[PDB]
């Protein structure tokens, strides 16, 4: 079930807000070229007051679109249904083991015409031959998933389309805007037109291995992994026509195919030895990886019958396009690892890799990454054994590095592409190389060429992330109080950055550079208490908490000005958190002509408008008056699992909180203003019914205006809110039938249970939307309520 649903004006409410917006600006509210007419006048003090309100019956003069009070979110949501079934079976003999499972999932999301499902089989087995010294094994899973996904932007469209627009037009077609009504598409119709854009996805995952133990402590092993998926889909383009929202009469189909084929191969050599007090592992080995991808698709326009049965490429009578390309990479890897344990109380560990990637030139192919960790089982040292209340306590510290090469397969190269221009754009800017050099106006193939996509860099190398870590494990009161702490410092250097080009460089001037650095340090804490009680109740709490800070250390000059990782391209994010943002400081509202004239010069400032702070004190409110106003890093997050067992019943709660987080709300643009949007007459949030006026002087909401004279759309503290939350992620209640009862139906375990996920949300009073975890337009987070069972033989 859809839960946190956004409150959005209704047809009557829409007309009240509009009258306010008009009269605030001092224009005749009867001049709205929609269907509203207003009986209004002035109060004793001279401020405008609304008396009555009449709406016409149709939105057009020719009466093809009736007037509604449509709740568009209720109209695009539904009660979802989930199903889940899984069977698994296992066998274990002296000479081997064997496992087999079958599974199914099916989930009809709360947004209509979106769903997902999965079929799964897995078989694993292993065999011990000779003297259990030759061993063969296999793990393999096979899966078929299929999905129809929510279109891009339906939540914003549902927020945007006014109640007055009906779901169905008089003729029974889909409803749409006409007359003066805004440029917004019918969101029910979008979802329905997209219901057959289903992909089918087959993934096969598994490995096979051989293991040899030629004598005591010596092992050899070789594993070949296979990871292969393929995805097919027809995407259909049906013709639409919702009022003035038209598509001409375009019909098309695109049959798309993709393949991802990855495989892995390694060989491993390990020695073990136990010398009275010394313990020790050594392991050296080698690994190969390779991915090869391909994708292609055929596109055809114009169909006589508009159903997925007809809409195959062979049956189109219009223009065709063909798409596709491949790519891939490979990795080689040489590694060793060394473990040592003295007297089971001092532990040392050593890792060393040399790692090559096809994504670099040979002059930089490999890089070498060592690692070191130490252990100190304090309690086994004899002077700690005067402490009956502390079972084990172990201090550990580690330093080590890891390469990163997760970059474009083409990162090294200067890329020219033919890009004739066969591909959907938006508003032009296809950047194609075809051109009617002849002046014929077309009708036939044009001459074309090549355009630069990327400048190469001969000396890209491995990026290095380096971590230092320290923590301590503990166990008190004979294993009932347990947990661990963690402190780490984590720095990425020579960071591999897709770096934009300087403006004058022009088309495709970007290049991947090792240029940039970024830290993450923080604390991590686990703590669990568990004990029985002397009336029948077992209780087991185990919670956790953590916090971190992130700081960008250096950055290419053109990425600092870019804003790609931070301050909106007005200030450089070097020295701030990844994703921090700069903006104007909103300092309330001008409430009196007095307060505009005494403020800095502010273009568009009047009574009822946002007062922006004069940060440089220059007596002018201009682009220079912005500062660091947004950081996405919580002060801390935390989780907690309560578990109870009483009298064959069991109860679980899992709580999760994030505390101290800034969110940026873009719904607030739609909820607090009549004109903080590109387009006039959109549906608005229900909060602006409380907008400041002479009438209503106790408010934070700017006075309703029809033009963003004050540019209150500018990034500002007005949109940052406290996105802190605590959520009951899950609660589950269970009964398990006593053994003596189920064991006679030959059942080691029979249990039924009942649960609800995401049932409850605690948030800040200063947050003004619904889900602080999903404050804008992403697929809503539903409340699930579940029943289920467990049977085992």
């Amino acid at each position: 079930m859809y839960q946190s649903k956004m409150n959005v004006l209704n047809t009557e409410q829409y007309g009240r807000a509009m009258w306010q917006a008009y009269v605030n600006d001092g224009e005749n509210p009867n001049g709205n070229a929609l269907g509203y007419a207003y009986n209004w006048g002035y109060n004793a003090d001279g401020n405008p007051v609304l008396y009555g309100m009449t709406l016409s019956k149709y939105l057009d003069s020719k009466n093809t679109m009736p007037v509604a009070d449509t709740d568009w979110f209720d109209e695009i949501t539904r009660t979802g249904v989930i199903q889940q079934y899984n069977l698994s079976v296992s066998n274990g003999s002296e000479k081997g083991s064997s496992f087999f499972s079958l599974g199914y999932y099916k989930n009809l999301g709360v947004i209509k015409d979106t769903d997902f499902d999965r079929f799964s089989a897995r078989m694993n087995s292993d065999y011990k031959l000779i003297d259990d010294i030759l061993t063969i094994g296999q793990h393999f899973t096979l899966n078929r998933t299929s999905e129809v996904q929510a279109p891009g932007g339906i939540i914003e469209t549902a927020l945007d389309i006014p109640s007055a627009i009906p779901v169905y037009a008089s003729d029974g077609s889909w409803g749409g805007p006409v007359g003066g009504w805004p440029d917004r598409r019918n969101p029910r119709a979008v979802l329905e037109y997209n219901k057959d854009n289903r992909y089918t996805y087959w993934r096969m995952f598994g490995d096979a291995y051989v293991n040899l133990t030629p004598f005591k402590g010596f092992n050899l092993r070789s594993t070949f992994g296979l990871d292969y998926a393929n995805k097919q889909a027809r995407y259909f383009t049906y013709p639409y026509q919702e009022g003035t929202q038209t598509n001409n009469g375009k019909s098309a189909v695109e049959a798309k195919q993709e393949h991802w084929t990855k495989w892995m191969w390694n060989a491993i050599a390990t020695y073990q030895l136990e010398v009275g007090k010394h313990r020790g592992d050594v392991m050296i080995g080698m690994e190969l990886n390779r991915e090869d991808d391909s994708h292609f698709s055929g596109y055809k326009e114009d169909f006589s019958i508009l159903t997925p049965d007809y809409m195959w490429p062979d049956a189109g009578s219009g223009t065709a396009q063909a798409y596709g390309a491949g790519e891939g990479y490979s990795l080689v890897s040489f590694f060793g690892k060394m473990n040592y344990s003295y007297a089971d109380r001092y532990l040392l560990s050593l890792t060393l890799r040399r790692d090559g990637s096809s994504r670099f030139g040979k002059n930089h192919r490999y890089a070498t990454f060592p690692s070191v960790s130490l252990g100190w089982r304090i309690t086994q040292e004899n002077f700690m054994k005067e402490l009956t209340w502390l079972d084990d306590l172990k201090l550990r510290a580690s330093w080590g590095q890891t390469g990163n090469q997760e970059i474009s397969n083409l990162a090294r190269y200067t890329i020219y592409a033919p890009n004739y221009g066969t591909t959907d754009s938006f508003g032009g800017q296809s950047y194609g190389t075809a051109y009617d050099i002849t002046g014929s106006n077309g009708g036939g193939v044009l001459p074309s060429g090549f355009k630069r996509n990327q400048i190469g860099n001969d000396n890209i190398k491995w990026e290095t992330t380096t971590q230092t870590n320290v923590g301590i494990d503990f166990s008190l009161f004979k294993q009932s109080l347990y947990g661990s702490l963690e402190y780490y410092y984590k720095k990425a250097t020579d960071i591999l950055t897709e770096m934009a080009g300087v403006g004058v460089l022009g088309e495709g001037g970007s290049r991947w550079i090792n240029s940039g650095a970024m830290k993450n340090q923080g604390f991590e804490f686990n703590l669990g208490y568990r004990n029985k009680t002397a009336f029948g109740l077992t209780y087991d709490l185990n919670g956790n908490i953590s916090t971190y800070r992130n700081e960008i250390l250096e950055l290419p000059e053109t990425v600092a000005a870019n804003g790609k990782f931070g301050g909106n391209g007005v200030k450089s994010v070097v020295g701030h958190t990844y994703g921090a943002q700069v903006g104007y400081i909103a300092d309330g509202i001008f409430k009196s002509q007095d307060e505009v004239d005494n403020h800095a010069t502010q273009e568009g400032a009047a009574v009822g408008r946002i007062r922006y702070r004069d940060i440089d004190h220059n007596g002018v409110i201009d682009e220079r008056d912005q500062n660091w106003i947004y950081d996405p890093t919580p002060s801390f997050s935390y989780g907690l699992n309560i578990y109870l067992e009483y009298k064959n019943f069991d109860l679980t709660m899992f709580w999760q909180g994030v505390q101290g987080v800034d969110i940026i709300s873009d719904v607030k643009k739609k909820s607090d203003f009549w004109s903080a949007s590109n387009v006039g007459f959109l549906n608005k949030g229900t909060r602006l019914l409380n907008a400041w006026s002479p009438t209503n002087p106790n408010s934070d909401i700017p006075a309703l205006t029809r033009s963003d004279t004050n540019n209150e759309q500018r990034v500002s503290t007005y949109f940052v809110e406290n996105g802190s939350f605590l959520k009951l992620r899950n609660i589950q209640l269970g009964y398990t039938v006593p053994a003596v009862i189920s064991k006679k139906m030959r059942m080691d375990r029979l249990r039924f249970y009942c649960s609800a996920q995401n049932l409850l949300t605690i948030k800040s009073k200063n947050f003004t939307g619904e889900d602080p975890e999903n404050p804008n337009f992403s697929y809503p987070i539903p409340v699930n309520i579940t029943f289920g069972l467990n049977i085992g033989f």
């Binding site: 000479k95 065999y127 011990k128 031959l129 030759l134 063969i136």
Partner: protein
Amino acid sequence: DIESIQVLKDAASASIYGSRAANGVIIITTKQGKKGQIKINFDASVSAS
């Protein structure tokens, strides 16, 4: 991985398997695990044409 290859050349013995057994059916079966054995083979060949 071949255990036995029956070839049902007849029609009164292959009539059970379908209408689509007018041209005769070739029944193939695959191997299985015997009782109390753990055997493992390894074949190879390198040829020239």
